[PDB]
Ligand binder design. Structure first.
Ligand SMILES: [Cl-]
Ligand SMILES: [Cl-]
Ligand SMILES: [Cl-]
Ligand SMILES: [Cl-]
Ligand SMILES: [Cl-]
Ligand code: NA
Length: 129
């Protein structure tokens, strides 16, 4: 599924991401834009051999199991393929665990380099939420 901007904003809000750990909704929409271009099926292999999955590009090194990341963990207790569904529930629940870790949203490289400090509210402008 390729979400629209406001479509994704509404889904993230319904799942309780708005202001989760203090991060406003536009931070999450911005992160999804630059991580996956709003595409739930996005996958990208990392240099260390792990892979990032889904709308928020969750990494198999710590968070999901894909059977090909030696020495990795599965802390969201989910197959990485479940993070590619059109229903973003699993991705949101796992992202809540990620952002609750010590570094907050800095765990998302694209957020840190392309969203952090910017006018992220622009990402929900015009949305009926
Ligand atoms: Cl593995
Ligand atoms: Cl959804
Ligand atoms: Cl934080
Ligand atoms: Cl950018
Ligand atoms: Cl915002
Ligand atoms: Na893993």
């Amino acid at each position: 599924k390729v979400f629209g901007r406001c479509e994704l904003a509404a889904a993230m809000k319904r799942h309780g991401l708005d202001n989760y750990r203090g991060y406003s909704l536009g931070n999450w929409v911005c992160a999804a834009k630059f991580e996956s271009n709003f595409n739930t099926q996005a996958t990208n292999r990392n240099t260390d051999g792990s892979t990032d999955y889904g709308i928020l590009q969750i990494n198999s090194r710590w968070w999901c199991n894909d059977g090909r990341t030696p020495g990795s963990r599965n802390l969201c207790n989910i197959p990485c393929s479940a993070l590619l569904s059109s229903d973003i529930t699993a991705s949101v629940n796992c992202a809540k665990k990620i952002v609750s870790d010590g570094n907050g949203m800095n765990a998302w490289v694209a957020w840190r380099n392309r969203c952090k400090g910017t006018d992220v509210q622009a990402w929900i402008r015009g949305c009926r939420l």
